[model samples]
Target chain A: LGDISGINASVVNIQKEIDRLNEVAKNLNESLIDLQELGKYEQYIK
Target chain B: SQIQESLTTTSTALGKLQDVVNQNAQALNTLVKQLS
Candidate 1:
């Protein structure tokens, strides 16, 4: 995926989704194995 | 890489998402602070 999703979503709604997204991201950011795995995400490099 | 890629994509997408959330929170917090 090129980016996160925020379409058809209002600012308030975005907050809910964003919070979820943020938590997941924060978790990934904090994970050592996850970070190491990110290098293999070639799709993101594009 | 699934979670990381997903997170990366999500964070990138969250640029707008976070901005909107932060904007709302800031709006609410600031509005409350001013009201208080």
Candidate 2:
């Protein structure tokens, strides 16, 4: 049988990277929403 | 062999996801500048 430990490790590392990217994306989206709310407040003040 | 092929496909998909996240970050930065 052929060994695939390296390939498995690569897949695991890739998955971790993907998870990290997802968290970054989520935080960015939250920031975008917060900024949008602030914009609305600015408009109201003006 | 099949597992290796699956891994390649998954890696390609992950690359695409990373690209999308980058684009989203750029858009968010522009929005921040506009808001400021």
Candidate 3:
């Protein structure tokens, strides 16, 4: 489970993982905010 | 063939979205470990 190097495989892959981590997190937080914003109109959707 | 493809196309797109959701969850989990 703690095998970052093993999972990432190579140095370039490590860099890729770092980039992926930030990119995916930003995407995720944006998605969460979108859902929360939509939830503000939950009474209508209901 | 008169077959349509909305089911096939939308389902594939939905499956990819689901994967993105699941993968993003994993990414968040890993990130929280760092904050802790």
Candidate 4:
């Protein structure tokens, strides 16, 4: 069979990107919570 | 055979990544709506 080292490397790289994306998602979830708190003050602004 | 297996694994991971990216997009949309 042809060498598949490149394919393995690509998979590793993709997994790294996925890990970073997960971290971003986690942060966004936190931000959403903060946004919900901000919404509570909407009455004052509007 | 090994090559095929490797490709299949990569495909599955790619699909999972696609799902994560889509979720991030939806989250962004929600954030935009909240801001506006």
**Candidate scoring better on lDDT of 1 and 3:** 1
lDDT scores in order: 0.59, 0.57, 0.49, 0.55
Tens digits of per-residue lDDT for model 3, A1-46: 4433322211112344445445555555322235777777968678
Candidate 4 lDDT, A2-37, residue by residue in tens: 333332111123775456556555555322245776
Best-performing candidate as measured by lDDT: 1
lDDT of 2 by residue, B1-36 (tens): 344455556666887876776677667656555555
DockQ of each: 0.06, 0.03, 0.04, 0.03
Per-candidate TM equals: 0.32, 0.43, 0.40, 0.43
Higher-DockQ candidate of 1 and 2: 1
lDDT tens readout by residue for model 1, B1-36: 647566666666668777777777766665556556
Sorted into a CAPRI-style docking class, model 4 comes out as incorrect
Give per-residue CA lDDT, model 3, range B1-36, as digits (tens).
Answer: 101233444456566667766776766676556556
TM-scores of chain A across the candidates, in order, are 0.31, 0.34, 0.33, 0.33
Candidate 2 collision pairs: none
TM-score of 2: 0.43
State in Å the error of residue A25, model 2. 28
Each model's interface RMSD (Å)?
14.7, 21.4, 13.8, 21.2
* Model 3 chain B weakest 10-residue run by lDDT: B1-10
Q: Per-residue lDDT tens digits of candidate 1, residues A1-46? A: 2222322223533455556666666766453555776877897787
**Candidate 4 Cα misplacement greater than 4 A, ranges:** A1-46
Count the clashes in each prediction. 1, 0, 0, 0
